[PDB]
Design a protein around this ligand. Structure first.
Ligand SMILES: Nc1nc2c(ncn2[C@@H]2O[C@H](COP(=O)(O)OP(=O)(O)OP(=O)(O)O)[C@@H](O)[C@H]2O)c(=O)[nH]1
Ligand SMILES: Nc1ncnc2c1ncn2[C@@H]1O[C@H](COP(=O)(O)OP(=O)(O)CP(=O)(O)O)[C@@H](O)[C@H]1O
Ligand SMILES: Nc1nc2c(ncn2[C@@H]2O[C@H](COP(=O)(O)OP(=O)(O)O)[C@@H](O)[C@H]2O)c(=O)[nH]1
Ligand SMILES: CCOC(=O)c1cn[nH]c1
Ligand SMILES: [Ca+2]
Ligand SMILES: [Ca+2]
Ligand SMILES: [Ca+2]
Ligand SMILES: [Mg+2]
Ligand SMILES: [Mg+2]
Ligand SMILES: [Mg+2]
Lengths: 438, 425, 54, 352
């Protein structure tokens, strides 16, 4: 058994992390006080769930997580919420004033002063791991902390844990849930300095989570709790293989092997289904074929784009609940003859399938209805480049006028780092086109 | 605990600041004695932003009252909420500033400034984490104008990395006290261009026209004009004083509202503006149409003459937030010729459930518009109308100033106008 | 349409289907970036205090 | 108040749609770089589809189907008909074609010569026509050596297809022609056919013993008005509209345009568009698409209709701009953005 340490950076990372560990506890049968009745080994054990939880002599199951924010208002909810008893004070790190949505401020000005404190707290969790696999880093693109400080933490983790894999769950900026005009700057700055330090990253576009909440959950104006509860279902479906018995994606290294044949193109597209409103009296349970056929509808994707006009480099089907291989291949066949699944000629045209019989867990009183089977598809398509294009375009509109640039220079960044980061994204976009277009 | 230190200087400064504390104190349940008596915990959630907590659960505003003559602050001290202020925070002289910027900035004011910074330093030292400062004052007088800008210069020297915002009443010949107000306004505007992060421009003529034309007040008084400012000041600080999905401090707001360091002069606005047909319920469309209407804006500048760099809108009251988004997106996508297309999503909206006292729902408007240049053009024209003949200059040269400094202030603002003009094309 | 590498356990199973065959900066360097930007902040702040002293 | 933008100033069609849009007093044209728009009259090449449907509150509509190039490219269409089962390689209404890459660059060189040698041995008509999309550059010849050598001299992909040696010739004149049908496809993927079609006729007598002079073989409106010496003799502008051509077929062939030619045209339009619907349908997409198409057909002496090519940015007959452009605003734009008949189209119902 090898351990995985999760790091939650900034408001988005921390609130999402809160939603994930709440779910993990309901999935592993852990109570808010950290006790786990089914765990027959008291204060020890190398079970699958032990990759995310350590154990105290008193039978408490403590998450292998760190929470870092440059202001205490978001992490204070963790210290007093339902699952306060799970973490100890060292795990929750808070500053006194944030980055003001200023990448340069979180990476340079403030980050330089607190980077050694975070690494120390992380080293503590590392020293409790007999064989650490790597890290899972949750953060936002637009936040000054999520963008500026995350990229610094990544650079240092690459130095202090060279042979360790690093994955990301990154929140793509969407206007419907933000009042930040400079988030394009931050997103492109942080992708530039993090690109060579991340082995695999799952971008979630708030615009996608927003529409899925209104369309399927019938929520007129979703909150962050609505958005995060849904996001934690996708994250849970993506991390399950590491926390349960299985043979597919059993360690962080397998995410790069199964989903990233080219290093810089390490942004798989996530698609989840079904998402059913709990307020519905009762729903007609979807079949293996239907929910699998939904994996190719643009609506239930974590990033709005048209995979029909891209090339697949890999594809992973993670089912949860009442699913058997017979049904999977039956639905797959039906979809190959009805859809547009164009693969890159230098990659096999296949699908890796993972099934976990325990259906998705639903937070009591949440928004998602209990379903008997659901699936999360991970596919590395050139189509996700559309998201880089949109973002890179907004960047160009403001940088042409040098708008808001003085705020970053004022914090010690050089103007050249803007264009240096932009030229990298131009390179990233050219890569997708060389692999996707003919 | 992100505290703000408030400073009000001069006659206009203190009478507007006074009403501001009267308004928010009512919103936070604080009575004239400093004791809380509201009925919601939201009133205390962010109470420490503007108030200190003393013994006996007393709440004392974090405000410093400054003036070069005793008269005005004697009124505040004896006003409605006069007792709520900290006695040690009254710093004032006896000579007065005679509506002379030079007296407030260089002579009279220079004699009193150190003692003011001693109170500021004292309030800051008691701050867990100081967000920044806010100053209320006019630009046409002597104390709030000359000494006010001298204070900002000295506050920036001692707190270089804190935010400095101001509510600055711009002079207008229609509502005028002295002919030298253009001189004083021109001198202060250059100080603000350098040493403030956000400046809310309030034009005394816009306030007058609103009371006369919209509010139906035959004869407006300075008190009437100050009701508008109090309500507006309450509106724009709602993001800071109450909870919500906002979570924005002064620096976070400046970062998203100011795309260029020198172009940080905003036009505020409020709605409704109803005459006494005052109990009529107002719909979200009406709130939105009025909030963007020029007649509801207090800078006396027509936004249809320039372009919005950034726009913030705050909605207060229990209303259809979905209906709010629909209407805002209707104003933008119906007049996208007035928003610069090189700042994506430069119109941000925020909602708050606690409405102002005596209103089911209100809307406050904060716009960074290149139309504000017309304000500086008026001031510059009046300045040159006199300075070309050196009229009334002896009041200033007698305080140690030189003509060269007037010429520079002139050039400085004509440059500020040129900068606003290049970003309009 | 072939299924390869089928693993079965009590909590689930996993397999692989094939439809068609195919056709860093050291720690020292990070300190220099952080400090370099801290020096540019110090310089900028110096020119401000030099401005305010004038 | 609806807002649109214009990004193809050379579009004679949508130049009239933009003109009519403003005429309604309810549509407002913005700068060609303002993202806050409802409708986009986008550019032909490299239209940034990926930036559509992301502005909060805006329902956006564009006048091009992303992926329709598979149908409007010479080589793409050939590959689409041969590899797509819906059309199969035995599609009876498309001339036997081959994709031939210049040797200075899969390719169907050997497969083309296989059928060629078979025809040369069987005494049959073995006249082919080489062409490409980068042309105004067309060569008609009966020797395979001349066809292949012409493509090698170029540098772009070409297609060799069977030249129709038995075309239906109008009389008097003994002249070749082609039929242009306009087909509009709205966001719901309904297939509407413009009732008005145009026959772009050759003002020169067809001659089968000389393919060097490409004036009686190429019915292009620019070749007849440039290299033809009888331009404008029989019909104004070498253009015969459906009303006349229908009366000719009755007096001459004792048949109607509907029965002899139009049923096949409607069948071909349906087959082509239905084939690619799963690939380009904007049904569940974040934005909406519609597009005008120009189908070029040939008719032989057996009254059998053949598909020449499909135009993605087609022009229009000068006498039909008003009626058609207005039709684009009724079913394609106002259907998604209503305003405060007897349709000029023919809905070709199908299964989605
Ligand atoms: N999906 C989701 N997005 C969030 C959440 N919280 C914030 N965001 C997004 O994050 C972006 C803003 O960045 P933040 O995470 O709030 O900033 P930060 O990391 O705390 O850094 P600071 O600027 O110092 O506050 C916006 O685009 C928000 O929409 C959340 O809980 N869920
Ligand atoms: N296989 C074939 N048999 C008979 N005629 C043919 C032919 N291929 C092309 N033509 C002639 O060429 C003309 C169409 O040429 P084509 O469409 O390939 O070039 P083009 O696309 O540049 C002209 P347009 O797009 O305006 O129709 C028709 O009028 C037709 O008479
Ligand atoms: N809105 C408003 N403006 C005022 C008030 N008092 C003075 N002014 C304006 O402020 C300018 C005079 O400045 P003042 O504050 O009296 O000078 P100071 O006390 O020396 O700083 C003139 O333009 C007046 O119109 C007031 O109570 N309300
Ligand atoms: C707004 C009220 O103003 C006055 O009373 C005034 C202004 N000048 N003189 C008197
Ligand atoms: Ca155990
Ligand atoms: Ca590495
Ligand atoms: Ca003295
Ligand atoms: Mg934050
Ligand atoms: Mg006065
Ligand atoms: Mg063509």
């Amino acid at each position: 058994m090898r351990e995985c340490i999760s790091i939650h950076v900034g408001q988005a990372g921390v609130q999402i992390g809160n939603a994930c560990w709440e779910l993990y506890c309901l999935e592993h049968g852990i109570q808010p006080d950290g006790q786990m009745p089914s765990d027959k080994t008291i204060g020890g054990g190398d079970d699958s769930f032990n990759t995310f939880f350590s154990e105290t002599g008193a039978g408490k199951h403590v998450p292998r997580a760190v929470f870092v924010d440059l202001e205490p208002t978001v992490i204070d909810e963790v210290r007093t919420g339902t699952y306060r008893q799970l973490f100890h004070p060292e795990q929750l790190i808070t500053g006194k004033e944030d980055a003001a949505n200023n990448y340069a401020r979180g990476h340079y000005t403030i980050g330089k002063e607190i980077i050694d404190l975070v690494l120390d707290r992380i080293r503590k969790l590392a020293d409790q791991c007999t064989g650490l696999q790597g890290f899972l880093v949750f953060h936002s693109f637009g936040g000054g902390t999520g963008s500026g400080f995350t990229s610094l933490l990544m650079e240092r983790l690459s130095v202090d844990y060279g042979k360790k894999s690093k994955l990301e769950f990154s929140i793509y900026p969407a206007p419907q849930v933000s009042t930040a005009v400079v988030e394009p700057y931050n997103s492109i700055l942080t992708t530039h300095t993090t690109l060579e330090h991340s082995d695999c990253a799952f971008m979630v576009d708030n615009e996608a989570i927003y529409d899925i909440c209104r369309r399927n959950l019938d929520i007129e104006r979703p909150t962050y709790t609505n958005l995060n509860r849904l996001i934690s279902q996708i994250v849970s479906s993506i991390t399950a293989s590491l926390r349960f018995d299985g043979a597919l994606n059993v360690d962080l290294t397998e995410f790069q092997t199964n989903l990233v044949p080219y290093p810089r193109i390490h942004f798989p597209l996530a698609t989840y289904a079904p998402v059913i409103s709990a307020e519905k009296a009762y729903h007609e349970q979807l079949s293996v074929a239907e929910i699998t056929n939904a994996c190719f509808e643009p609506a239930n994707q974590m990033v709005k784009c048209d995979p029909r006009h891209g090339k697949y480099m890999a594809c992973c089907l993670l089912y949860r609940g009442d699913v058997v291989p017979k049904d999977v291949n039956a639905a797959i066949a039906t979809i190959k003859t009805k859809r547009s699944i164009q693969f890159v000629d230098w990659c096999p045209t296949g699908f890796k399938v993972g099934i976990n019989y325990q259906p998705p867990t639903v937070v009591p009183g949440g928004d998602l209805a209990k379903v008997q089977r659901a699936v999360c598809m991970l596919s590395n398509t050139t189509a996700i480049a559309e998201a880089w294009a949109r973002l890179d375009h907004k960047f160009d509109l403001m940088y042409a006028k040098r708008a808001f640039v003085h705020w970053y220079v004022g914090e010690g960044m050089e103007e050249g780092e803007f264009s240096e980061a932009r030229e990298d994204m131009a390179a990233l976009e050219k890569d997708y086109e060389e692999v996707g277009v003919d | 605990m992100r505290e703000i230190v408030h400073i009000q200087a001069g006659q206009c400064g203190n009478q507007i600041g006074a009403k501001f504390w009267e308004v928010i104190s009512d919103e936070h349940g604080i009575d004239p004695t400093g004791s809380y008596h509201g009925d919601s915990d939201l009133q205390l959630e962010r109470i420490n932003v503007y108030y200190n907590e003393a013994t006996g659960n007393k709440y004392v505003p974090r405000a410093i009252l400054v003036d070069l003559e005793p008269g005005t602050m004697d009124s505040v001290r004896s006003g409605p909420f006069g007792q709520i202020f900290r006695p040690d925070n009254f710093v004032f002289g006896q000579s007065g500033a005679g509506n002379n910027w030079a007296k407030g900035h260089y002579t009279e004011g220079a004699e009193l400034v150190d003692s003011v910074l001693d109170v500021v330093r004292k309030e800051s030292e008691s701050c867990d984490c100081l967000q920044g400062f806010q100053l209320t004052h006019s630009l046409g007088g002597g104390t709030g104008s000359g000494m006010g800008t001298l204070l900002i210069s000295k506050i920036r020297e001692e707190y270089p990395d804190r935010i400095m915002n101001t509510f600055s009443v711009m002079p207008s010949p229609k509502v005028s006290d002295t002919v030298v107000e253009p001189y004083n306004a021109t001198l202060s505007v250059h100080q603000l261009v350098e040493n403030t992060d956000e400046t809310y421009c309030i034009d005394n003529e816009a306030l007058y026209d609103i009371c006369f034309r919209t509010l139906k007040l035959t004869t407006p008084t300075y008190g009437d004009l100050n009701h508008l400012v109090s309500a507006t000041m309450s509106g724009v600080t709602t993001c800071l004083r109450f909870p919500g999905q906002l979570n924005a401090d002064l620096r976070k707001l400046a970062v998203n509202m100011v795309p260029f360091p020198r172009l940080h002069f905003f036009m505020p606005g409020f709605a409704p503006l109803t005459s006494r047909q005052q109990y009529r319920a107002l719909t979200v469309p009406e709130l939105t149409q009025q909030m963007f209407d020029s007649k509801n804006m207090m800078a006396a500048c027509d936004p249809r003459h320039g372009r919005y760099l950034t726009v913030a809108a705050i909605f207060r009251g229990r209303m259809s937030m979905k209906e709010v988004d629909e209407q805002m997106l209707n104003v933008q996508n119906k007049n996208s010729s007035y928003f610069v297309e090189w700042i994506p999503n430069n119109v941000k909206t925020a909602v708050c459930d606690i409405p102002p006292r005596g209103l089911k729902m209100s809307a406050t408007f904060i716009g960074n518009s290149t139309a504000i240049q017309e304000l500086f053009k008026r001031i510059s024209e009046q300045f040159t109308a006199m300075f070309r003949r050196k009229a009334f200059l002896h009041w200033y040269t007698g305080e140690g100033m030189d003509e060269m400094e007037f010429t520079e202030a002139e050039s400085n603002m004509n440059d500020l106008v040129s900068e606003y003009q290049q970003y309009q094309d | 349409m072939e299924v390869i590498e089928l693993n079965k356990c009590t909590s689930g199973q996993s397999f692989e289907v094939i439809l068609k065959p195919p056709s860093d900066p050291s720690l020292e360097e990070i300190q220099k970036k952080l400090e370099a930007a801290e020096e540019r902040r110090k310089y900028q702040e110096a020119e401000l205090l030099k401005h305010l002293a004038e | 108040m609806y807002t649109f933008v214009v990004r193809d100033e050379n579009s004679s069609v949508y130049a009239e749609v933009s003109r009519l849009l403003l005429a309604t007093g309810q549509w407002k044209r913005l700068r060609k770089d303002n993202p806050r728009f409802n409708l986009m009259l986008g550019e032909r090449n490299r239209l940034p589809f990926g930036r559509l449907g992301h502005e909060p509150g805006l329902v956006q509509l564009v006048n091009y189907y992303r992926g329709a190039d598979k149908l409007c490219r010479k080589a793409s269409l050939v590959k689409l008909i041969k590899t797509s089962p819906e059309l199969s390689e035995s599609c009876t209404w498309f001339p036997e074609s081959y994709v031939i890459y210049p040797t200075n660059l899969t390719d169907e060189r050997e497969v083309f010569l296989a059928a060629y040698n078979r025809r040369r041995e069987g005494r049959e008509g073995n006249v082919w026509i080489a062409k490409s999309s980068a042309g105004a550059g067309i060569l008609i010849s009966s020797e395979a050596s001349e066809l292949l050598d012409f493509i090698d001299e170029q540098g772009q992909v070409h297609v060799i297809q069977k030249y129709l040696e038995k075309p239906l010739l109008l009389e008097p004149g003994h002249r070749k022609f082609d039929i242009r049908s306009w087909v509009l496809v709205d966001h719901l993927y309904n297939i509407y056919l413009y009732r008005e079609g145009v026959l772009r006729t050759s003002s020169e007598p067809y001659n089968s013993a000389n393919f060097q002079d490409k004036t009686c073989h190429l019915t292009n409106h620019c070749i007849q008005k440039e290299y033809s010496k009888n331009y404008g003799r029989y019909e104004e502008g070498n253009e015969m509209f459906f009303e006349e051509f229908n009366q000719y077929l009755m007096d001459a062939l004792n048949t109607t345009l509907e029965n002899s030619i139009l049923l096949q045209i409607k069948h071909i339009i349906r087959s082509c568009l239905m084939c690619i619907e799963p690939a380009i349908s904007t049904k569940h997409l974040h934005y909406q698409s519609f597009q005008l198409f120009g189908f070029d057909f040939m008719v032989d002496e057996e009254l059998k209709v053949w598909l020449i090519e499909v135009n993605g940015a087609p022009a229009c007959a000068q006498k039909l701009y008003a009626e058609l452009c207005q039709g684009i605003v009724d079913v394609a734009i106002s259907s998604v953005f209503p305003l405060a008949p007897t349709s000029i189209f023919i809905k070709l119902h199908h299964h989605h």
